Amino acid sequence: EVKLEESGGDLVKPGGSLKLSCAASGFTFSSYGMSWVRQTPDKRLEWVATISSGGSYTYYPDSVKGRFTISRDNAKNTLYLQMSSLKSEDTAMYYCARRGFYFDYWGQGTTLTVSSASTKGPSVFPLAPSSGGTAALGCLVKDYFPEPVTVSWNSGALTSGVHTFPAVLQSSGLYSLSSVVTVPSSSLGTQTYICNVNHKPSNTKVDKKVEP
């Protein structure tokens, strides 16, 4: 019943600033310390800030001291991370976490990309399907920046047999990936298959119906 939901991640220029938010629910927020932990592209985890339950004590590692400020609003049940003087090494997925020493609940994460490059939304192309039984179909999600994109099928209702591949960085400096699913081949003419692509940094949403 404990939930932590982060928001605010974006692409930001080197030297810029960004404020992340974390909305807590399902526990007495004011009775716990709260923390932020980030995960870099190499998948290492780095603790970056802790605040006491009442907000009076805060703790930071040397890598972010004076650039990052953790704060909370107990009336609103929200935690914040104010980030400034952003550096290339700050690029990461940032996790809201409950408690100040070990972390018994984690949020879903919000992503920061520190970059002077421009954001670009993806182009989405069908991967058309079609003995028988099992057909394969999917979507090619091409030429976006930065990561990540999220891909669902039929607005999250089709999950069985879905494989969304890791993005690959192309020479153009843009990312590409495919998402595929295997379905019963007998349903292709009646059952509808739509891939839903969300690229938050460019505020682009694309739904592609994939037809035989």
Binding site: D104, S123, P166, S178
Partner: protein
């Protein structure tokens, strides 16, 4: 600053067996060590605190041991759903620090890939590029050879492979190989073939199409 080190980048086990993951702190941390499980595409989930305590809802098959500097996470009765990265973390002092993670991998029986090929969509060619996608679905083990032939000419350098993590339910991999051509090069040839070699196949399987048909 107190560090924690995980020397095993990977650990492999089979369903029903056990696996142990080590974690070494650079100085005495008492029992102030936690373990986390991170399944593909998910945030970390808490498993163990104070070296050996299990949260409510964590099965008893997850155990932790150690005090001082040497800590061990042991997963007994391993399930396919345990495919994940496992991290230790010390909290005897700030700064709080994490190990680099150990990926627990699941051995299973051989499963041949199901192979599919997808021509470039008409939508895509309109912009001067052609992506041809070959899909290898639900196979094990990871080793797989994919060869692109264009009018029987072997391609090399102009394709990229991406692989999923082992599936939480059946422990298989899936892989995409994407051949990227200029539209002008794509229109210069007819037969596009993806050939797949794998332990589960008696001999290589080929999926192909003729551009324009």
């Amino acid at each position: 600053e107190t560090t924690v080190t995980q020397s095993q980048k990977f650990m492999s086990t089979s369903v029903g067996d056990r696996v142990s993951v080590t974690c070494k702190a650079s100085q005495n941390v008492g029992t102030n060590v936690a373990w986390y499980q991170q399944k593909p595409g998910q945030s970390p989930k808490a498993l163990i605190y104070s070296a050996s305590y299990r949260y409510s809802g964590v099965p008893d098959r997850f155990t932790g041991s150690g005090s001082g500097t040497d800590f061990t996470l042991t997963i007994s009765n391993v399930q396919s759903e345990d495919l994940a990265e496992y991290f230790c973390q010390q909290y005897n002092s700030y700064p709080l620090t994490f190990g680099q993670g150990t990926k627990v991998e699941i051995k299973r029986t051989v499963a041949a890939p199901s192979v599919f090929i997808f021509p470039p969509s008409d939508s895509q060619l309109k912009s001067g590029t052609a992506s041809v996608v070959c899909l290898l679905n639900n196979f094990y083990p990871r080793e797989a050879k994919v060869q692109w032939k264009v009018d029987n000419a072997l391609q090399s350098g102009n394709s990229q492979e991406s692989v999923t993590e082992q599936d939480s339910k059946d422990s298989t991999y899936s892989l995409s190989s994407t051949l990227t051509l200029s539209k002008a090069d794509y229109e210069k040839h007819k037969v596009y073939a993806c050939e797949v070699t794998h332990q589960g196949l008696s001999s290589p399987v080929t999926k192909s199409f003729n551009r324009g048909e």
